[PDB]
Design an enzyme around this catalytic site. Structure first.
Site, PDB file in Angstrom:
ATOM      1  CD  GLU A   1     -35.355 -28.207 -26.563  1.00 36.19           C
ATOM      2  OE1 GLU A   1     -34.266 -28.557 -26.056  1.00 36.19           O
ATOM      3  OE2 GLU A   1     -36.579 -28.316 -25.914  1.00 36.19           O
TER       4      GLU A   1
ATOM      5  CG  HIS B   1     -38.486 -19.678 -19.315  1.00 34.31           C
ATOM      6  ND1 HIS B   1     -37.262 -20.059 -18.547  1.00 34.31           N
ATOM      7  CD2 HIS B   1     -38.697 -20.761 -19.897  1.00 34.31           C
ATOM      8  CE1 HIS B   1     -37.143 -21.187 -18.305  1.00 34.31           C
ATOM      9  NE2 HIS B   1     -37.958 -21.739 -19.293  1.00 34.31           N
TER      10      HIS B   1
HETATM   11  C1  LIG Z   1     -33.572 -26.369 -23.615  1.00 38.76           C
HETATM   12  C2  LIG Z   1     -34.674 -26.514 -22.956  1.00 38.76           C
HETATM   13  N1  LIG Z   1     -35.756 -27.537 -23.493  1.00 38.76           N
HETATM   14  C3  LIG Z   1     -36.796 -27.669 -22.788  1.00 38.76           C
HETATM   15  C4  LIG Z   1     -37.255 -27.000 -21.497  1.00 38.76           C
HETATM   16  C5  LIG Z   1     -38.435 -27.147 -21.053  1.00 38.76           C
HETATM   17  N2  LIG Z   1     -38.311 -27.886 -19.742  1.00 38.76           N
HETATM   18  C6  LIG Z   1     -37.808 -27.454 -18.486  1.00 38.76           C
HETATM   19  S1  LIG Z   1     -37.844 -28.608 -17.440  1.00 38.76           S
HETATM   20  C7  LIG Z   1     -37.970 -29.991 -18.592  1.00 38.76           C
HETATM   21  C8  LIG Z   1     -38.011 -31.238 -17.951  1.00 38.76           C
HETATM   22  C9  LIG Z   1     -36.618 -31.465 -17.271  1.00 38.76           C
HETATM   23  O1  LIG Z   1     -36.452 -32.537 -16.839  1.00 38.76           O
HETATM   24  P1  LIG Z   1     -35.173 -33.134 -15.759  1.00 38.76           P
HETATM   25  O2  LIG Z   1     -33.835 -33.115 -16.043  1.00 38.76           O
HETATM   26  O3  LIG Z   1     -35.356 -34.602 -15.205  1.00 38.76           O
HETATM   27  O4  LIG Z   1     -35.476 -32.049 -14.501  1.00 38.76           O
HETATM   28  P2  LIG Z   1     -36.186 -32.347 -13.050  1.00 38.76           P
HETATM   29  O5  LIG Z   1     -37.369 -33.790 -13.274  1.00 38.76           O
HETATM   30  O6  LIG Z   1     -34.979 -32.892 -12.214  1.00 38.76           O
HETATM   31  O7  LIG Z   1     -36.990 -31.253 -12.666  1.00 38.76           O
HETATM   32  C10 LIG Z   1     -38.427 -29.436 -19.581  1.00 38.76           C
HETATM   33  C11 LIG Z   1     -38.795 -30.469 -20.717  1.00 38.76           C
HETATM   34  C12 LIG Z   1     -36.085 -25.993 -21.290  1.00 38.76           C
HETATM   35  N3  LIG Z   1     -36.437 -25.372 -20.125  1.00 38.76           N
HETATM   36  N4  LIG Z   1     -35.117 -25.980 -21.778  1.00 38.76           N
END
Ligand SMILES: Cc1ncc(C[n+]2csc(CCOP(=O)(O)OP(=O)(O)O)c2C)c(N)n1
Ligand SMILES: Cc1ncc(C[n+]2csc(CCOP(=O)(O)OP(=O)(O)O)c2C)c(N)n1
Ligand SMILES: [K+]
Ligand SMILES: [K+]
Ligand SMILES: [Mg+2]
Ligand SMILES: [Mg+2]
Lengths: 329, 362, 363, 329
Positions: free
Chosen positions: D59, D128
């Site tokens: 972000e 959220h």
């Molecule tokens: C700062 C922020 N940006 C975007 C999101 C939306 N978001 C939540 S989880 C996620 C995917 C995260 O990927 P990963 O680190 O691989 O998590 P996993 O696959 O292990 O669940 C996104 C894009 C968020 N919660 N917080």
């Protein structure tokens, strides 16, 4: 004796460091540069690497480290050089610290404190002149205070250290240097100022005046002047932005029937806004003989040129003028 | 009569993730040498000047001087083009001048005057110019922006590039590492440049960074480390690095290894975190303006006479710029509200109180 | 029939980054650990699939990320570290909170939003907390700096504890992570940075998001190791090594766990427009963490298939009794809406949707 | 032809992109996953990788890159998955974007657009659920807007893309699925909604009810119930949140003499704070025949349980309650 806001804050931190080893301090240039505004002077030479910590320039990342030390059950003071640079961290303050006790069902208290200059300085222009009262005031789980004088500062920040929840201390860069009388009782290591209580700094009967931070200085001067046309101002120093002592304000408007609010930060969704909202909604509305009016800074990001700058935060002139419009004198 | 050019030997760069660096040999023409000296010396004198205009209070707020770093700002301009793009932090005077801005216009903003380049609105940190984008006072915040500028080059497909500087204390800011990754992922025409001047406000490179090899911080991004005290080096790594971007191999890190003679801003006595006699040592043995001079005089590119004439003409642009910006009217107060929005109809902006009204026009 | 008291299994060997030796390739596993580790993965798997069911039935709302496929991870980890050490993670924390002391009743109830769940119905899936488990965090990346501080706290209290700070492939491109790295490196904080790389960052796969999927190297100045995240036995051998490291005052380390999530991203993501069902089907046959260990156990006579089937039923039987509780269990009382904003404070008053709505609030 | 809010947004971007090529869009899951809430569905396929960029979970980074593109003359649309996330990058929004034009003395414009869901969803909980209308509406240099129905979203987005200043378009996730009819002129690819103008959704004479985003539909809800009893509410839909249309609120108050304001976010320093303040400072004040009062979310971090969440946002129940206290009927 006289002590400047700067050393007032210093003894507070010092008394606390002394008193509880669980408390430490960290920020940029905080140890061996003796702090950017020299607030933390000598603190390093006395407590060493362990308790007074110089950080790299990674706001996000040390706010986080502080939030987390607090979760593990330390009692950190985190310095931002100025709150303008707190925006890089604001999600650490907001989402990690503030909402935790709550989300956690009351199992994880976050005892943090975030202190630093906030608001307007001199000729630092737009990216650095910004006031954050409004923003931090708006959120559950923060306590957000804003000192003015020395008694204010040493009392407000000790308290803040003792508290078990996030407290954001909006200091003022132009007040660091200003000496005030320091009462014998504020010289005590015990001097706490309850967060959530305002303080009437001047009695008077013709009109209530509320402001926080440095603006308080300017209402006293504006009140001093008006006293010479025998107009009595009641000047309330807010000290706490959240949770704001609305009662003392109300009690005063029921005596005076007239309200003016004076703040440094911008107008829209300002600290003024809410105090008015709060009045209209509370019992004091039917006692208001004239509308309450806000005196704010100007609705522009901060210019540089001196002439411009002065006309963008509140002068004594601007305060008098509002008061003269309200009291229709 | 003079030799027309000379070849000089310049320091082999340190490379990271590259097989070959920029050339160790370079050619300097009399006509560039004189142009490059005139520039370094304009920037240098424009700073001795502002410093003095600070001390008499004629300037306020921030003022971060950039002397010692004149190899950088000139060397850079030397190896990019007008059509390329430059973005930087607050130590911006040198770049502002090398990108089309007159001394009159720079000095007039430092002293906050209508004839200054930001019309008095932004002071020392917020000067913008043609394809120069500041002038940024929030540390590390200009790296993603420079990567975005990069993105627009690549997207317009005009084959331009972008130099995006941050200093050494800034090389821990999260927003840089994110930027390296998009930079590399999308293969952006973005040169990342780190002005390592050994200090980060007061805190020296090793007290704040776990590794002090900033040219390798990029990691997956290929980097090179340079002598930012020598104008020729800075020009050869830039050209090299700009070749690399122009051909589409994405981003590339440059660690420009320089030095600042003054403290941080003018409110830093400058000497708590460093002896005054380290600063003296650097000024004596590797000053950048004093390095172009030893090269030029010695290879018969110019006479001790000609460079003196230039100190002189320079002494002059500076006096007049000083004197035009001290006697210039502040902005009219009616124009406090101007330029909040672009391309909008006129409207009204609120003063200290609700009866103070200001007109705002784009 | 005599069972063995233990066996030796070879584990995959780890890829190293600024490391001398890495963890050994050959561990002993006793029978009683086997039984227990199996039971735990089984509880997690069963718990996840019940959460799925309940979510499809509308009894769970909002977020619901299942760790399904990555049970080697949490039991792996709990098994390489003390209960007095520390752990903090993102939002797919259903597994850790169990492995960290919480009960299935408690977890299934917080999910269903009931007075009995661990955060008394206030948290949801993303926010649960136990002794030395700081959740339970929905801002991708935020947990990495916190964790580095929990780790600083350890150094500060001089107790030899260590902090485990888990993030995923997705999060691994967050600026603050790199801020954290620098700080732990610099301060020599006892902090295992772990990259739970399960190949997906929501719907955006590794390649398209990192310019470099060598996560165990991302830290760069901080040594790193890459680990088989479907092999409970590695994870435990690697963890054990990395804690020893962090514990020996040498500072922070980085551990990449290569693993997999059977479910799409979160209940609302079908999980099937960014990879194929066979991609999934194949992994669940070659590397499932439970089957992979059951073979290990049956083959080395650490136990019989009939015995391990007795564990299956019992856990299964018990997840059923937990969910029976969490559907039955009452919702929280309205009175409590405003409880627990501040800590160690007098009770106070909180504004409702308008001014004639007041909610008591107590610490 | 009924169209959903989500379709209205999608249509606008599609129309704008097609019409100008300097415009493109960026964020997580926008491209191939079709947008996190499928808002950007089909757009990748139309315009390809050059124009629809999937970006990492960065972000603070990509907020920044998009502002760089804007400065360099591109016209980015910059999606945040929710506004709770844009806190990380808020400093690129305020400090780079918003102030830039004015710091450069009218030299550097920033034609960016930031957009995404804002405020509360359903059982997404504390980190959220938060409204940021108040926070963004504060800073000079920005334009903040908050669509309600579908006409709103299309006009407001397209205006947003055409403005040359940094514009925050806070949308609302629960509204995406909701189908409204779509008058003929709103299907025209020429349809803009002037930033700065509110619109009355419902003529009334008894009270003025003022809102933005999702709550606006509850106001019309509550007016249907109330009108059955002889009360006639004038539901005003704010649309813009800075430069907000006070004159339209004020011309309406001057006719109804009463005022309720309704908003999704927290009370202290809220949208309604600023509406009251203005009213009271403004000519309408003396037309008031009762205090104006506010309905907001409760002053807690969003809880997860259904009945806790339910009582944390404003119902048709609570608006009606306030309209009766105010009308004293
Ligand atoms: C700062 C922020 N940006 C975007 C999101 C939306 N978001 C939540 S989880 C996620 C995917 C995260 O990927 P990963 O680190 O691989 O998590 P996993 O696959 O292990 O669940 C996104 C894009 C968020 N919660 N917080
Ligand atoms: C985000 C942020 N944090 C802190 C500051 C205060 N600050 C201004 S300059 C500075 C030091 C940066 O030093 P360096 O990167 O070495 O650049 P140099 O001054 O040497 O040019 C700091 C910490 C700031 N402006 N922005
Ligand atoms: K504290
Ligand atoms: K635009
Ligand atoms: Mg530096
Ligand atoms: Mg993942």
């Amino acid at each position: 004796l006289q002590v400047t806001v700067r050393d007032a804050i210093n003894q507070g931190m010092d008394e606390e460091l002394e008193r509880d080893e669980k408390v430490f301090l960290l920020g940029e240039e905080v140890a061996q540069y003796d702090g950017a505004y020299k607030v933390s002077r000598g603190l390093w030479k006395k407590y060493g690497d362990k308790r007074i910590i110089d950080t790299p320039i990674s706001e996000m990342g040390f706010a986080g480290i502080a939030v987390g030390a607090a979760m593990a059950g330390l009692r950190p003071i985190c310095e931002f050089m100025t709150f303008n640079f707190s925006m890089q961290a604001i999600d650490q303050v907001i989402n990690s610290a503030a909402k935790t006790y709550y989300m956690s069902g009351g199992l994880q208290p976050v005892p943090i404190v975030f202190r630093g200059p906030n608001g307007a300085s001199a000729g630092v222009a737009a990216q650095h002149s910004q006031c954050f009262a409004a923003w931090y005031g708006h959120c559950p789980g923060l306590k957000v205070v804003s000192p003015w004088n020395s008694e204010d500062a040493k009392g407000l920040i000790k308290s803040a250290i003792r508290d078990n929840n996030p407290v954001v201390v909006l200091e003022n860069e132009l007040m660091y240097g200003v000496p005030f009388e320091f009462p014998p009782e504020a010289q005590s290591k015990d001097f706490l100022i309850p967060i959530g209580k305002a303080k009437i700094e001047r009695q008077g009967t013709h009109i209530t005046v509320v402001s926080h931070s440095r603006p308080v200085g300017h209402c006293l001067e504006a009140a001093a002047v008006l006293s010479k046309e025998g107009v009595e101002c009641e000047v309330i120093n807010m000290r706490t932005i959240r949770p704001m002592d609305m009662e003392t304000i109300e009690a005063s408007v029921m005596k005076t029937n007239h309200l003016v609010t004076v703040e440094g930060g911008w107008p829209q969704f300002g600290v003024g806004a809410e105090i008015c909202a709060r009045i209209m909604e509370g019992p004091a509305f039917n006692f208001l003989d004239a509308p309450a009016v806000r005196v704010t800074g100007a609705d522009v990001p901060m210019p540089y040129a001196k002439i411009l700058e002065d006309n963008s935060i509140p002068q004594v002139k601007d305060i008098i003028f509002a008061i003269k419009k309200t009291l229709n004198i | 009569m003079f030799a027309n050019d000379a070849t000089f030997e310049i320091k082999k760069c340190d490379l990271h993730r590259l097989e070959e660096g920029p050339p160790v040999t370079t050619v300097l023409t009399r006509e560039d040498g004189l142009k490059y000296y005139r520039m370094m010396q304009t920037v240098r004198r424009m700073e001795l000047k502002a410093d003095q205009l600070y001390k008499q209070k004629i300037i306020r707020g921030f003022c971060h001087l950039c002397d010692g770093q004149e190899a950088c700002c000139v060397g850079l301009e030397a190896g990019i083009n007008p059509t390329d793009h430059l973005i930087t932090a607050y130590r911006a005077h040198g770049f502002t001048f090398t990108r089309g801005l007159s001394v009159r216009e720079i000095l007039a903003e430092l002293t906050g005057r209508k004839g200054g380049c930001a019309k008095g609105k932004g002071g020392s940190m917020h000067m913008y110019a043609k394809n120069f984008y500041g002038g940024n006072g929030i540390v590390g915040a200009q790296v993603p922006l420079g990567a975005g500028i990069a993105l627009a080059c690549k997207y317009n497909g005009k084959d331009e590039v972008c130099l995006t500087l941050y200093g050494d204390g800034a090389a821990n800011q999260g927003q840089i590492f994110e930027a390296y990754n998009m930079a590399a992922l999308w293969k952006l025409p973005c040169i990342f440049i780190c002005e390592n001047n050994r200090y980060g406000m007061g805190t020296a490179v090793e007290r704040a960074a776990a590794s002090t090899d900033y040219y390798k911080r990029g990691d997956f991004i290929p980097g090179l480390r340079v002598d930012g005290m020598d104008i020729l080096c800075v020009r050869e790594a830039t050209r090299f690095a700009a070749a690399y971007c122009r051909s589409g191999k994405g981003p590339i890190l440059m660690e420009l290894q320089t030095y600042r003679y003054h403290g941080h801003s003018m409110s830093d006595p400058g000497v708590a975190y460093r002896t005054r006699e380290e600063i003296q040592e650097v000024r004596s043995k590797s000053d950048p303006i004093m390095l172009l001079k030893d090269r030029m005089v010695n290879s018969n590119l110019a006479s001790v006479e000609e460079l003196k004439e230039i100190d002189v003409e320079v002494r002059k642009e500076i006096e007049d710029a000083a004197q035009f910006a001290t006697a210039d009217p502040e902005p009219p107060l009616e124009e406090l509200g101007y330029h909040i929005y672009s391309s909008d109809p006129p409207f009204e902006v609120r003063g200290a109180n609700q009866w103070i009204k200001f007109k705002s026009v784009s």
